[PDB]
Symmetry: C2
Subunit: 125 residues, 2 copies
């Protein structure tokens, strides 16, 4: 599995996200509860967690391969992702394989992504 | 299943994007120039243009397989995503494999993704 060649623009520092209570938060200030509340109000969307099992360098430049356990039943998915790709980790906040690189592209502060990190995402119900 | 980078960025709905020049634009109001006008601005930022070479349905319902020619060297890359995944197309704007579904989920006007479409984004030089 190979990730989309493009990243969503809202990762840029200073970008504003629209929260479910009508709230607007700067992308760097996002919290887990923001995802939770946004999914809760939305009839269309639900929250989904993916635990990181393994992290490894790819054969392609600026790309790392990450094994995820996706959702309930822990579905096994390996994806080639850019080392700069920010993930939002449960109880942690923004995390990428190359935080310093994320700081260059999006100027987004990131923890180092590690095994055991639970990545939260918005998904369909 | 689908790993976090594969999933559509549903939290981009109603977002306000911060451009590299310091300008602000609502996500639905983004233009191709905004990617290009921000291309020359810094040293690290660069425009990655991935041309869709193929669009095929997948055995998985509501999922499409897209082949891209990626970057300057035109690397062949196959990506499996939900049909409503937004891409920003050169001279077109927001597009996906299911414009109607993208419009409902992301609350934006959406065109149809085509084998001619050039998908653009911000990557590193």
């Amino acid at each position: 599995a190979m990730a989309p060649p493009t990243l969503p623009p809202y990762f840029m520092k200073g970008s504003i996200i629209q929260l479910a209570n009508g709230e607007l938060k700067k992308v760097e200030d996002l919290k887990t509860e923001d995802f939770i509340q946004s999914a809760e109000i939305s009839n269309d969307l639900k929250i989904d967690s993916s635990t990181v099992e393994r992290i490894e360098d790819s054969h392609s430049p600026g790309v790392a391969v990450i094994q995820f356990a996706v959702g309930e039943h822990r579905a096994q998915v390996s994806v080639e992702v850019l080392v700069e790709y920010p993930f939002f980790v449960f109880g942690q906040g923004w995390s990428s394989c190359c935080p310093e690189r994320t700081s260059q592209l999006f100027d987004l502060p990131c923890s180092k992504l590690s095994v055991g990190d639970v990545c939260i995402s918005l998904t369909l119900k």
